[PDB]
Amino acid sequence: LRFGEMERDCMIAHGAASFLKERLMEASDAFRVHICGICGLMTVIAKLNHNQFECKGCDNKIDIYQIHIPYAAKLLFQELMAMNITPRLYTDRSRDF
Amino acid sequence: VLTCPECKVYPPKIVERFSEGDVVCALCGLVLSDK
Amino acid sequence: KEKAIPKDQRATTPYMTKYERARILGTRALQISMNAPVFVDLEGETDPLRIAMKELAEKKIPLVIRRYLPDGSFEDWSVEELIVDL
Amino acid sequence: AATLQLGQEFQLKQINHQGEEEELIALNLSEARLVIKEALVERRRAFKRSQKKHKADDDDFMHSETREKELESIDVLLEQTTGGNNKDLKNTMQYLTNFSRFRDQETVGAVIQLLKSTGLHPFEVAQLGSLACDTADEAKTLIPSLNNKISDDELERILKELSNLETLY
Amino acid sequence: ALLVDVMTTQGGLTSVTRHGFNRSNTGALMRCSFEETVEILFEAGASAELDDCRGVSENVILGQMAPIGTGAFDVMIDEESLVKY
């Protein structure tokens, strides 16, 4: 069933962030993505059986992060990147590097 | 190839639950693949 | 640790909001339902939410609320020292 | 580290939890083995004290007659302090014990004093404490950092003195 | 009063349209949320715009917990009272 924009606004009015987050991600589409810690992109190749993590472009095998995001957000980022635009996800504590 | 890691029976017996988006072993009831 | 405000210079309300109350009750109910020790004399109750309310009644929840000021600093208030309306 | 390329993670200047710059600390096989043995026996003593709180023999472990008795004491220490879940620690400790150039603390202190009296790099000092070289040129070739930095006579004197300092087993 | 104060806070009359609010300084995803998506994305890319991910829309796109009511604070454990028991 459609949990539209009006419903989201009503839930924001009430002030219940946890219900919103659970409805949005855990109940519809949750996805786990490995991102590079230098270029902040989703180009990291991960072999989970051998836990081999590699970033080909930046020659990175250490700074690699796990992020929980929806699947439509991943699709949007890929479609943005297919037109020569770079949505570069960054982490809170990545300013040290 | 998709086999139950507890029954260890070949060939594996498997039933797909489409209305729940699951793949279920028909002997131990274990759920193999979801969505 | 520069952000933390000394206890004497705390300028926030000494009452606890409804949002803080709901968050605290939810956290305590989850922890109780995950087999955490209970700090009060349980009497015939089998619902984690009701035991959470019971612990709140005697002011025995060992949690601290951190309140974020807009600049980035924060203010720490123990659940024991927060006045809850009834 | 042929060209002393230690990187950011292993810089000569280290920033500790107190925020003050410190010289980078490098230990050879003997120093590291003694430090880990001391830490393990201290932890065992703390565990025994805690157990006594809830409810003599330790002098024989540090003083070992032979290499085999030392290895047996090491196995007992790992059983009573580590739990046997860490095989890499056992392998490292065995490698330290089998190829420890120096067993006594005083002799290790003598080696440290001899190597660091000249003020060489900690990497070179630890390498010299780990490696026993017959000739100065052998060490200079096997330690490219020592080239152009130490006179051959001084290196020969240090190597001969270290070889003399080795305790016979 | 709140609506009127919002409409006249930038020193002038800012209409409630794309020209008034979607040309503001707010976050890129927030502004692209309604009625001028692709052009705003193009402009943000060309100008190398930095988004801060603090508004509601940016925390709804990324599937996280927005600082909204119950999410405006952090819950932490007090060791002193726990030990005292």
Next chain:
Amino acid sequence: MFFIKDLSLNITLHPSFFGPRMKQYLKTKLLEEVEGSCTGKFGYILCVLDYDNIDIQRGRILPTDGSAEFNVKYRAVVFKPFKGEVVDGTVVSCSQHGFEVQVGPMKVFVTKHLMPQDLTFNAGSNPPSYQSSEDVITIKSRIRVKIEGCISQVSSIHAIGSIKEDYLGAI
């Protein structure tokens, strides 16, 4: 190579351990998880100093599952080599392509192209070894290897070294 470094870790404590003895559980978790591990950023985690002086930070209950996360800082002795490093070690296995040398907790391999031709492989010897005019290298023989490269994975670091130049082999 042995060095002293400052390390930190985030440890999650389950809600069922929420009692007056939480510090003991945190210490046990730290000792059981950290000691003996390997991190490509800092090499193998050999030992942790000043166990009684463990630094702790206030908990921050995660909003999704109730497990309390803690940040623990400490000082540790770790082992990590560098490019061009020369280390003594012990021969583990002998092969026609070269040999493998254990140094500390790591393995450095040398290919037959990386030693001078004077060292010839003898298979009839027990065990098979490398024999030359002056130096003979076999099991339990102290051998110096100049490490040339290292490959770092989650749980281990492999190395490749060369002994092609002089003053290398048996000591």
Next chain:
Amino acid sequence: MVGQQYSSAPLRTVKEVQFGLFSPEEVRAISVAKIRFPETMDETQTRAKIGGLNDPRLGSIDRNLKCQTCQEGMNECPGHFGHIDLAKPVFHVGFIAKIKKVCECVCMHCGKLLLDEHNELMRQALAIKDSKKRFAAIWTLCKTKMVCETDVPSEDDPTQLVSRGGCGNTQPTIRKDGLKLVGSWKKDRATGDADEPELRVLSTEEILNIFKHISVKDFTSLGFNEVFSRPEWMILTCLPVPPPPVRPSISFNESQRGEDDLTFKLADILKANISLETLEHNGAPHHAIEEAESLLQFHVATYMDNDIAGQPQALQKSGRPVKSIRARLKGKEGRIRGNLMGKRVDFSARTVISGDPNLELDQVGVPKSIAKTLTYPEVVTPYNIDRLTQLVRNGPNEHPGAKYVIRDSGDRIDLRYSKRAGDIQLQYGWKVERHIMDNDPVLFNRQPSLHKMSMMAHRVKVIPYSTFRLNLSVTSPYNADFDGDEMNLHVPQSEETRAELSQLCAVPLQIVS
């Protein structure tokens, strides 16, 4: 607990999203397969052609084979990017206006700004921090200087002329015709020639060369960035190819694969590119080269945006327009407003309402079957293991009962097939997915949700028949009657969520609006 796998990379949360632009170097480095052929699948019609559009190194969407690059199933492979090399640079359909505006503001020969620090107006423009207004003012000021000045009067003395190194040539006037950028040189009247502006179509490679010559101070002044947003990158040289996840193939049967529109457009792009390349090396006349370049530009432009003003629309073989990338995102049903702000959900129901005067104010009657379908993950503890054991023994065909049992390790046992309704022994920390039982909080609403009081919490009571039940006093906040209205029910799945529904959104707390 997403992914059904374990990884040692730490969990973190997104804080910033720094936009920018690819350099061709980045497109080359990132890519793992240089696409080369206009075909997807081999001549055996059983496997994809290597180096084609469906190269296995990019990934697979099917549930049997795994990706060659990462050796993971379709439920874990994100997808990897290819790239295509272009014979000659092509304009990007989304920056034609900015390219022209920044072209008119820079000398066409010396590659420098028409003004400098000497003018006061330049000081005023460089005093502004807002990049958009700064660029607009600089454009509207410098669009009218058709000649570069070699010498400028000094600020201290207007009679003293200082040379700024200008070339002194004459800049054209630029107009746009379709996808072409045509310039006209107005020769000076003192030259003796007529005032006829010679017209010429500007070549993209020349404009690229001019842009590559701009400096860092002009980078900042114009409103671009050195690292992320150089202007030279606004002209395409290599085109990234999205993985098959972005363009999934729908397979009716084993040999029946209907491909997406995006892959057809990409195949046409590559076909035109190879045609232009084979005409380029064959010594063809200049007219054919120009026509082929125009065709390539048309295909690349209509691949991203298919609603360009003043041009025909690229149509499909059946006559329908090709759905470009922009039409995927711009609509009301597009990604932003149809899959990221609102989306379909699980653990929900929808049914007509009715009136019940015997129910309390904040209590809702839930039909039996709807209670048998939705669940709740209760955790086994010392206080509930007896009732939970009896519930598991009951099974899934009886209310109350259970439907699944989750272990500590994440494995989930379907109680229906596993005969072990009377066999499974429960431990501490396992989860029973039980039916919804009396006095469970739910969220309940009616559309459209105009105000706060149209989405409220309730306590369940399990009843027969197929309707929902409400007290006759809550029908005013909902603006609902009982002649056919249907409302929606959402079930929380945790303790924190249940506490939020019980302490914030309850009907008793919503009386004084």
Next chain:
Amino acid sequence: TRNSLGNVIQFIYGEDGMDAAHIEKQSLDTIGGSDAAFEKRYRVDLLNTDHTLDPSLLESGSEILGDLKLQVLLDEEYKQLVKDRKFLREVFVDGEANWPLPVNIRRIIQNAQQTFHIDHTKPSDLTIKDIVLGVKDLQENLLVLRGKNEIIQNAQRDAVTLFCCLLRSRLATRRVLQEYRLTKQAFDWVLSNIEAQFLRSVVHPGEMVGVLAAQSIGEPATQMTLNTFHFAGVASKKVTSGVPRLKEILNVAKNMK
């Protein structure tokens, strides 16, 4: 009240920091009425026969008459009431008295009269000192902002000005002793209840007031369409109002109809 970037939209929500559901319509009695009625209602004089307290009302009515400190206190109170009348007439130039405010003081006083079975036929044991000092202290114990520099003090007094005006209007000495006939116990109960009910009306930090305001404004806009064309019932009054007028206000159109 701020936004995602941190820009302040209001320095206090609503200019008094009150929740929108703790506010009821109450009448300020000082604004309206002629000067004679005001003087008779609120003025008390212990030296002039015209405006004395009847001794049958106050238990100590006999001894208090002729005192000096008491009349000074009453004079300060009357000066405060006069200044309040001037200010309130400055604010509402229309002279209207009913405005929304927190706490229903009338119901609190009625509850005090009903609970304690107060009999109006007997003298009351109150003291003028006690009444005046109690009202002033209760004003001293009303808090919305808890800063310490002078800026926050000024902001808080500005916030609580009008409520203090109403509170002074209802709890005047003559009104207490002659209209309510409260005792000491009932007076203490009323003061405590007033303070308690005020302290629970402040707005809770974390509330999303923007969406609340937007929903409040735009819900009646949906129903506004029906009755927009009532001005369509007057042909000579062809003036834009209703949906098109709101549209033009929102668009900030430069060419009105």
